Design a protein around this motif. Sequence first.
Motif, PDB file in Angstrom:
ATOM      1  N   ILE A 264       0.841  -1.188   0.000  1.00 46.62           N
ATOM      2  CA  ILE A 264       0.000   0.000   0.000  1.00 46.62           C
ATOM      3  C   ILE A 264       0.879   1.242   0.000  1.00 46.62           C
ATOM      4  O   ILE A 264       1.862   1.323   0.744  1.00 46.62           O
ATOM      5  CB  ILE A 264      -0.959   0.013   1.208  1.00 46.62           C
ATOM      6  N   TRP A 265       0.515   2.213  -0.841  1.00 48.68           N
ATOM      7  CA  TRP A 265       1.119   3.532  -0.839  1.00 48.68           C
ATOM      8  C   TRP A 265       0.047   4.543  -0.443  1.00 48.68           C
ATOM      9  O   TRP A 265      -1.128   4.357  -0.773  1.00 48.68           O
ATOM     10  CB  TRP A 265       1.691   3.919  -2.208  1.00 48.68           C
ATOM     11  N   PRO A 266       0.410   5.614   0.261  1.00 44.90           N
ATOM     12  CA  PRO A 266      -0.627   6.439   0.908  1.00 44.90           C
ATOM     13  C   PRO A 266      -1.378   7.375  -0.028  1.00 44.90           C
ATOM     14  O   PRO A 266      -1.254   7.290  -1.257  1.00 44.90           O
ATOM     15  CB  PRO A 266       0.165   7.225   1.957  1.00 44.90           C
ATOM     16  N   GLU A 267      -2.170   8.269   0.569  1.00 49.85           N
ATOM     17  CA  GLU A 267      -2.960   9.231  -0.187  1.00 49.85           C
ATOM     18  C   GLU A 267      -2.101  10.043  -1.138  1.00 49.85           C
ATOM     19  O   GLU A 267      -1.077  10.610  -0.741  1.00 49.85           O
ATOM     20  CB  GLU A 267      -3.696  10.178   0.762  1.00 49.85           C
ATOM     21  N   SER A 268      -2.544  10.110  -2.395  1.00 50.28           N
ATOM     22  CA  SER A 268      -1.888  10.919  -3.417  1.00 50.28           C
ATOM     23  C   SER A 268      -0.399  10.598  -3.509  1.00 50.28           C
ATOM     24  O   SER A 268       0.411  11.464  -3.831  1.00 50.28           O
ATOM     25  CB  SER A 268      -2.104  12.408  -3.142  1.00 50.28           C
ATOM     26  N   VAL A 296      -1.815  -1.200  -3.935  1.00 50.67           N
ATOM     27  CA  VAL A 296      -2.903  -0.244  -3.821  1.00 50.67           C
ATOM     28  C   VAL A 296      -2.263   1.102  -3.504  1.00 50.67           C
ATOM     29  O   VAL A 296      -1.421   1.189  -2.605  1.00 50.67           O
ATOM     30  CB  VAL A 296      -3.898  -0.689  -2.733  1.00 50.67           C
ATOM     31  N   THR A 297      -2.620   2.140  -4.256  1.00 49.52           N
ATOM     32  CA  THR A 297      -1.915   3.402  -4.091  1.00 49.52           C
ATOM     33  C   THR A 297      -2.831   4.575  -4.396  1.00 49.52           C
ATOM     34  O   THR A 297      -3.715   4.497  -5.256  1.00 49.52           O
ATOM     35  CB  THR A 297      -0.665   3.492  -4.982  1.00 49.52           C
ATOM     36  N   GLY A 298      -2.597   5.669  -3.677  1.00 52.76           N
ATOM     37  CA  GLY A 298      -3.261   6.910  -3.999  1.00 52.76           C
ATOM     38  C   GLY A 298      -2.670   7.558  -5.235  1.00 52.76           C
ATOM     39  O   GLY A 298      -1.508   7.355  -5.587  1.00 52.76           O
ATOM     40  N   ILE A 299      -3.496   8.360  -5.897  1.00 53.43           N
ATOM     41  CA  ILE A 299      -3.097   9.065  -7.111  1.00 53.43           C
ATOM     42  C   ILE A 299      -4.156  10.126  -7.348  1.00 53.43           C
ATOM     43  O   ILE A 299      -5.224  10.089  -6.729  1.00 53.43           O
ATOM     44  CB  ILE A 299      -2.972   8.101  -8.312  1.00 53.43           C
ATOM     45  N   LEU A 407     -10.569  -3.114   6.476  1.00 52.76           N
ATOM     46  CA  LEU A 407     -10.775  -1.706   6.191  1.00 52.76           C
ATOM     47  C   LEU A 407      -9.461  -1.130   5.695  1.00 52.76           C
ATOM     48  O   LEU A 407      -8.382  -1.580   6.082  1.00 52.76           O
ATOM     49  CB  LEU A 407     -11.247  -0.957   7.436  1.00 52.76           C
ATOM     50  N   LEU A 408      -9.554  -0.162   4.795  1.00 54.84           N
ATOM     51  CA  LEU A 408      -8.374   0.490   4.253  1.00 54.84           C
ATOM     52  C   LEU A 408      -8.558   1.997   4.323  1.00 54.84           C
ATOM     53  O   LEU A 408      -9.561   2.527   3.843  1.00 54.84           O
ATOM     54  CB  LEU A 408      -8.117   0.059   2.806  1.00 54.84           C
ATOM     55  N   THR A 409      -7.590   2.689   4.906  1.00 53.14           N
ATOM     56  CA  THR A 409      -7.567   4.136   4.781  1.00 53.14           C
ATOM     57  C   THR A 409      -6.142   4.561   4.466  1.00 53.14           C
ATOM     58  O   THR A 409      -5.177   4.025   5.021  1.00 53.14           O
ATOM     59  CB  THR A 409      -8.113   4.842   6.045  1.00 53.14           C
ATOM     60  N   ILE A 410      -6.018   5.474   3.514  1.00 56.53           N
ATOM     61  CA  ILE A 410      -4.747   6.081   3.162  1.00 56.53           C
ATOM     62  C   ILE A 410      -4.886   7.581   3.365  1.00 56.53           C
ATOM     63  O   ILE A 410      -5.955   8.156   3.131  1.00 56.53           O
ATOM     64  CB  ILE A 410      -4.314   5.730   1.721  1.00 56.53           C
ATOM     65  N   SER A 411      -3.815   8.211   3.824  1.00 56.38           N
ATOM     66  CA  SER A 411      -3.954   9.588   4.266  1.00 56.38           C
ATOM     67  C   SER A 411      -2.599  10.270   4.190  1.00 56.38           C
ATOM     68  O   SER A 411      -1.550   9.623   4.211  1.00 56.38           O
ATOM     69  CB  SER A 411      -4.536   9.646   5.688  1.00 56.38           C
ATOM     70  N   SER A 443      -2.339   3.485   5.844  1.00 56.74           N
ATOM     71  CA  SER A 443      -1.096   3.853   5.180  1.00 56.74           C
ATOM     72  C   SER A 443      -1.036   5.372   5.057  1.00 56.74           C
ATOM     73  O   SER A 443      -1.959   5.993   4.522  1.00 56.74           O
ATOM     74  CB  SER A 443      -1.008   3.190   3.805  1.00 56.74           C
ATOM     75  N   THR A 444       0.037   5.975   5.560  1.00 60.30           N
ATOM     76  CA  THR A 444       0.155   7.426   5.522  1.00 60.30           C
ATOM     77  C   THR A 444       1.500   7.859   4.951  1.00 60.30           C
ATOM     78  O   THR A 444       2.458   7.084   4.877  1.00 60.30           O
ATOM     79  CB  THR A 444      -0.023   8.053   6.906  1.00 60.30           C
ATOM     80  N   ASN A 445       1.538   9.131   4.545  1.00 57.31           N
ATOM     81  CA  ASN A 445       2.748   9.737   3.999  1.00 57.31           C
ATOM     82  C   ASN A 445       3.869   9.786   5.033  1.00 57.31           C
ATOM     83  O   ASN A 445       4.996   9.343   4.769  1.00 57.31           O
ATOM     84  CB  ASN A 445       2.417  11.142   3.509  1.00 57.31           C
ATOM     85  N   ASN A 446       3.589  10.364   6.208  1.00 55.25           N
ATOM     86  CA  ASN A 446       4.606  10.473   7.246  1.00 55.25           C
ATOM     87  C   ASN A 446       4.056  10.161   8.632  1.00 55.25           C
ATOM     88  O   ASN A 446       4.609  10.638   9.626  1.00 55.25           O
ATOM     89  CB  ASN A 446       5.255  11.871   7.229  1.00 55.25           C
ATOM     90  N   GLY A 447       3.000   9.358   8.727  1.00 57.57           N
ATOM     91  CA  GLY A 447       2.415   9.036  10.016  1.00 57.57           C
ATOM     92  C   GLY A 447       0.962   9.459  10.080  1.00 57.57           C
ATOM     93  O   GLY A 447       0.572  10.430   9.429  1.00 57.57           O
ATOM     94  N   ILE A 448       0.144   8.733  10.836  1.00 56.44           N
ATOM     95  CA  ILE A 448       0.523   7.542  11.582  1.00 56.44           C
ATOM     96  C   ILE A 448       0.134   6.293  10.804  1.00 56.44           C
ATOM     97  O   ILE A 448      -1.046   6.050  10.552  1.00 56.44           O
ATOM     98  CB  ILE A 448      -0.119   7.546  12.969  1.00 56.44           C
ATOM     99  N   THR A 449       1.137   5.507  10.428  1.00 58.48           N
ATOM    100  CA  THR A 449       0.950   4.291   9.649  1.00 58.48           C
ATOM    101  C   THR A 449       0.894   3.098  10.597  1.00 58.48           C
ATOM    102  O   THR A 449       1.785   2.925  11.434  1.00 58.48           O
ATOM    103  CB  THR A 449       2.084   4.129   8.639  1.00 58.48           C
ATOM    104  N   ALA A 450      -0.160   2.293  10.483  1.00 58.94           N
ATOM    105  CA  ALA A 450      -0.389   1.253  11.478  1.00 58.94           C
ATOM    106  C   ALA A 450      -1.347   0.208  10.934  1.00 58.94           C
ATOM    107  O   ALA A 450      -2.098   0.455   9.988  1.00 58.94           O
ATOM    108  CB  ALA A 450      -0.955   1.836  12.782  1.00 58.94           C
ATOM    109  N   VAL A 451      -1.313  -0.966  11.557  1.00 61.87           N
ATOM    110  CA  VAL A 451      -2.350  -1.976  11.401  1.00 61.87           C
ATOM    111  C   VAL A 451      -3.143  -1.995  12.698  1.00 61.87           C
ATOM    112  O   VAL A 451      -2.570  -2.157  13.780  1.00 61.87           O
ATOM    113  CB  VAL A 451      -1.768  -3.364  11.088  1.00 61.87           C
ATOM    114  N   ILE A 452      -4.452  -1.798  12.595  1.00 60.57           N
ATOM    115  CA  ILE A 452      -5.353  -1.843  13.736  1.00 60.57           C
ATOM    116  C   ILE A 452      -6.088  -3.172  13.687  1.00 60.57           C
ATOM    117  O   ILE A 452      -6.533  -3.595  12.615  1.00 60.57           O
ATOM    118  CB  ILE A 452      -6.337  -0.661  13.713  1.00 60.57           C
TER     119      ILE A 452
END
Length: 510
Positions: A264-268, A296-299, A407-411, A443-452
Motif C-alpha cells: 500500500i502507498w498512501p494518499e496521493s 494499492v496506491t493513492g493518485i 478496512l483500508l484508509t490512506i492519508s 497507510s500514511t505519507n509520514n504518520g501515523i501508519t499502522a495496522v489496527i
Amino acid sequence: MAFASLIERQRIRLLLALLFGACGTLAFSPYDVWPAAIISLMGLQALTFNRRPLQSAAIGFCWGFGLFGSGINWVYVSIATFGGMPGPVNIFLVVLLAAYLSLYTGLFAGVLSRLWPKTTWLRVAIAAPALWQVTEFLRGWVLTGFPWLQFGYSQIDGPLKGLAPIMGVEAINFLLMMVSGLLALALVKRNWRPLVVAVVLFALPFPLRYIQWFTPQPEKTIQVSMVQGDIPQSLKWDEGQLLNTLKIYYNATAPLMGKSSLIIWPESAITDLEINQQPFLKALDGELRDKGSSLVTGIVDARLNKQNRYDTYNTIITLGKGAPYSYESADRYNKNHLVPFGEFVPLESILRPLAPFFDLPMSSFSRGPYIQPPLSANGIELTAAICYEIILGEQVRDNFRPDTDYLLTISNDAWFGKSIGPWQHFQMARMRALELARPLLRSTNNGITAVIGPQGEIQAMIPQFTREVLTTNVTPTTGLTPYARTGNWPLWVLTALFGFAAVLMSLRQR
Ligand SMILES: CCCCCCCC/C=C\CCCCCCCC(=O)OC[C@H](O)CO
Ligand SMILES: CCCCCCCC/C=C\CCCCCCCC(=O)OC[C@H](O)CO
Ligand SMILES: CCCCCCCC/C=C\CCCCCCCC(=O)OC[C@H](O)CO
Ligand SMILES: CCCCCCCC/C=C\CCCCCCCC(=O)OC[C@H](O)CO
Ligand SMILES: *[Se@H](CCCCCC)CCCCCCCC(=O)OC[C@@H](O)CO
Ligand SMILES: CCCCCC[Se]CCCCCCCC(=O)OC[C@@H](O)CO
Ligand SMILES: CCCCCC[Se]CCCCCCCC(=O)OC[C@@H](O)CO
Ligand SMILES: CCCCCC[Se]CCCCCCCC(=O)OC[C@@H](O)CO
Ligand SMILES: CCCCCC[Se]CCCCCCCC(=O)OC[C@@H](O)CO
Ligand SMILES: CCCCCC[Se]CCCCCCCC(=O)OC[C@@H](O)CO
Ligand SMILES: CCCCCC[Se]CCCCCCCC(=O)OC[C@@H](O)CO
Ligand SMILES: CCCCCC[Se]CCCCCCCC(=O)OC[C@@H](O)CO
Ligand SMILES: CCCCCC[Se]CCCCCCCC(=O)OC[C@@H](O)CO
Ligand SMILES: CCCCCC[Se]CCCCCCCC(=O)OC[C@@H](O)CO
Ligand SMILES: CCCCCC[Se]CCCCCCCC(=O)OC[C@@H](O)CO
Ligand SMILES: CCCCCC[Se]CCCCCCCC(=O)OC[C@@H](O)CO
Ligand SMILES: CCCCCC[Se]CCCCCCCC(=O)OC[C@@H](O)CO
Ligand SMILES: CCCCCC[Se]CCCCCCCC(=O)OC[C@H](O)CO
Ligand SMILES: CCCCCC[Se]CCCCCCCC(=O)OC[C@H](O)CO
C-alpha cells in the motif's frame, strides 16, 4: 461585593466553562486521559444549571470554545505553512473556526436550559443525551460538517469500548453525556442516588469489551507492507520531484514483490495525473503480477467525462495480482467527502459566478459516489476511505460489506506537522476497526501508519516522520457486529424515545 454581583458570578462560570472544555482535549490522543471526558462534560452539565437560557447558551459556547480552541487549533500548522497570510490573520481564522463549532455547544446548552430549566435527573440523563445527539449531528452535517472531538472516541481503550460494535461510537457519546450529567447532579444536589446510578450505568457495559463479534480467518493470513515515503509537501509542479517520489516508492516496493501479498502507498502517493503515468503503472503492474503481489496506491485522476470536461478525483487505484491495472478498471475508489477548506470551500458554488476567473483555483475536486464497492487485490476485499473519510462512521459502515476482509484508509497528515491533530485522526480511525470488527490498514505519507486489529487495538505501527516500510502479517476477519448490521438507527430510535419523553414532560408544565 463586586466579585459577588450577578454579572460577575456569570463571568466566573464562563471562565470555568472555558477550562472544563479545554480539559476535554486531554481525553483524546495523544493524551488519552479518558476520565477527562467525564470531567469535561460534568462541568458543562453543572455550569449550565440554574441559568436563564441565554446565560446557559453563553456557558455552552465558552465550554465549546475551550474544547475546540485547545483541541483543534492544530489546523494553525497548515494555515501558517501554506496559507501565505499574516500571523494575526492565521490566529483569527483558528479563533473563527473554534467559535463556529462552539455555536453547536451553545445551541445545546441554550435549548437544554430553555426546555428543562430545573436541576433534575430528567434534564441531565434523558433530555441532555438526546439533545446532545441532535446538536452533535448538526455540527457533523451543516456545511458538510466537522464532527471532530466526539468523546466516544476517547473510549477506544476504555471501559465503554464494548458499546461501539453494538451501536457505534455515538452510543458512547450518548452514555458519556448521561453518566456525566448524573455525576454533576449528584455533586450539585449533594445526593448519593444519582452517583450510584451513574456508576452502575457506566459499569454495566464493561464486560461487553470481551465480546468478539468476529471470527479470524488464519487460512487467509498474508504479509502486508505499507510504504511510508515521508515526502515533503510540494508547492509548484516539478517532474523532477515527481520522479524522485516514484523512485522512493518503487525502490521500497521492489524487494517486497513476491513476499508481501499486499503493498500500500498512501494518499496521493503518486503526485501526478493517472493519465500521465500509464507507462509507469503498466510496467509496475506487470512486475507485481509476475511475482504474485498487488499494490494499492493513492493518485490524482483527472478523468475526461462525456461532457469533455475533466472530473478531478482524489483516488485509490489497484495493480498487480488479482487487480490488473487499467485506466478503465472499476477496481478503484474516488474520494466522496472532500476536506472542507482543504479540497473545497463551503458555499463556494453559490459564489462562483461573482469571482474573477483568474482568481478561481486552477481546478477543483469532484466527488466519488457515497457508496462504492470494495477494492479487490490478490483476492482481498478492502473497504476504502481516504483520509478524513475514516472519521465518518456511518459512511464507512454504509460502504462496508459482509465480505469485506480489511478496512483500508490512506492519508497524508503531513500538513499538520508535529501537532496532536494526526493523533486525534488516528484515534478515530481505530474506532472503525472496532465498530466493524475488521482489521484496519492505515497507510500514511509520514504518520501515523499502522495496522489496527478487529477490536481497535494497535497491532503494528511505525514512527511518524520516518521514511520506512511497515511490514507485518495480518489476518482477515469475518462476522457482523450489530452496528455493522444496523448502522445508527437504533441509537436514533433511543434518541427519539428519550427526546419524546423529555419534551412531553417539559410541556406537561403548562
Ligand atoms: C478567553 C479565551 C480567549 C479569548 C478569545 C481570544 C482568542 C485568543 C486570541 C489570541 C490569543 C493568543 C493565541 C496564543 C498565542 C499565539 C500562538 C502562536 O503565536 O503560535 C505560533 C507558533 O508558531 C505556534 O506553533
Ligand atoms: C476574553 C474575551 C472577552 C470575551 C467576553 C466573555 C465571553 C462573551 C460571552 C459570550 C461569547 C460571545 C458571543 C459568542 C457568540 C456570538 C457569535 C460568535 O462570536 O461566533 C460567530 C462564529 O464565529 C461564526 O462563524
Ligand atoms: C493551562 C491552563 C491552566 C488552567 C488549569 C486548568 C486547565 C484546564 C485543563 C486542561 C487544559 C489543557 C488543554 C489541553 C492541552 C491542549 C494542547 C494544545 O492545545 O495543543 C495545540 C495543538 O492543538 C496541538 O498541537
Ligand atoms: C422500556 C425500557 C426503557 C426504554 C429503552 C431503554 C434503553 C434501551 C437501551 C439500549 C437498547 C438495547 C437494544 C438495542 C441495542 C442493540 C441493537 C442492535 O444493534 O442489535 C440489532 C442487530 O440486529 C443485532 O444483530
Ligand atoms: Se468564552 C471564555 C470567557 C471566559 C472569561 C469571561 C470573562 C470567549 C470566546 C471568545 C469569542 C471569540 C469570538 C470569535 C469571533 O470573533 O468571530 C468573528 C465572527 O463574528 C466573524 O463572522
Ligand atoms: C469524575 C470522575 C471522572 C472519571 C472517573 C474515572 Se475513575 C479515575 C481513575 C481512572 C483510571 C483509568 C486510567 C486513566 C487513563 O486514561 O490513563 C491514561 C493513559 O492511558 C495515558 O495517559
Ligand atoms: C480541568 C478544568 C477545571 C477548572 C477548575 C474548576 Se474548580 C470548580 C469545581 C466545581 C465544578 C463547576 C462549578 C459548579 C457550579 O457552579 O455549578 C453549580 C451551579 O450550576 C448551580 O447553580
Ligand atoms: C475578541 C475576539 C476577537 C478575535 C480576533 C482576535 Se485574533 C488575535 C491576534 C493576536 C496577534 C498575535 C501576533 C501574531 C504574529 O505572529 O504577529 C507577527 C506577524 O505580523 C508576522 O507574521
Ligand atoms: C432545521 C433542521 C434541524 C432539524 C432539527 C432536528 Se435534526 C433530527 C436529526 C435527524 C437524524 C438523521 C440522522 C441520519 C444519520 O445517520 O446521520 C448520522 C448521525 O447519526 C450523526 O452523524
Ligand atoms: C475530580 C472529580 C470531580 C468531581 C467528581 C465527584 Se462526583 C460528585 C458526587 C457527589 C457525592 C454525593 C454526596 C451525597 C451526600 O453528601 O449526601 C448523602 C449523605 O447524607 C450521606 O451521609
Ligand atoms: C447507550 C444509552 C443507554 C441508555 C440507558 C437508559 Se437506563 C434509564 C436510566 C434512568 C435515568 C437516570 C436515573 C437517575 C436517578 O434516578 O437519580 C435521580 C434520583 O435519584 C433523585 O431522587
Ligand atoms: C455496578 C455494575 C455491575 C456490573 C458491571 C460489570 Se463489571 C463492573 C466493572 C466496571 C469497570 C469500569 C471502570 C473501569 C476503569 O476504571 O478503567 C480501567 C482503566 O484501567 C482503563 O484505563
Ligand atoms: C463556514 C463554516 C465552516 C464550515 C463547516 C465545516 Se468546519 C471546517 C473543518 C475544519 C477544517 C478541516 C480540518 C482539516 C482536517 O480535518 O484534515 C483531516 C485530514 O485531512 C488529515 O489530513
Ligand atoms: C483558546 C482559543 C485559542 C484559539 C487560537 C489558537 Se492559535 C495556536 C496555534 C497552535 C498550533 C498548533 C501547534 C502544533 C505544533 O507545535 O506543531 C508545529 C510544527 O509541527 C510545524 O511543523
Ligand atoms: C441499559 C441497557 C443498554 C444496553 C445497550 C448495550 Se447491550 C444491547 C444488546 C447487546 C447484544 C446485542 C445482540 C446482538 C445479536 O445479534 O444477538 C441477537 C441474536 O443472537 C438473535 O438471533
Ligand atoms: C424501546 C427500546 C428503545 C431502545 C432502542 C432499541 Se432498537 C431494538 C433493535 C431490534 C433489533 C432489530 C434488528 C433489525 C435488523 O437487523 O435489520 C437490518 C437493518 O437494520 C438494515 O438496515
Ligand atoms: C430535543 C431533541 C430530542 C430528539 C428529537 C429528534 Se429524534 C431524530 C429522529 C431521526 C429519525 C431517523 C434518523 C435517520 C436514521 O436513523 O438513519 C439510520 C441510518 O443511518 C442507518 O442506521
Ligand atoms: C447571551 C449570548 C450567548 C452567546 C453564545 C450563544 Se451560542 C448559541 C447558538 C444557538 C442559539 C440558541 C441557543 C440559546 C437558546 O436556545 O435559548 C433558548 C431561546 O431560544 C433563547 O432564550
Ligand atoms: C464562518 C467561518 C468559520 C469557519 C472558519 C474556517 Se478557518 C479555515 C481553516 C483551514 C484548514 C485547512 C485544512 C486543510 C489542509 O490543511 O490541507 C488539506 C488538504 O488540502 C487535503 O486534505
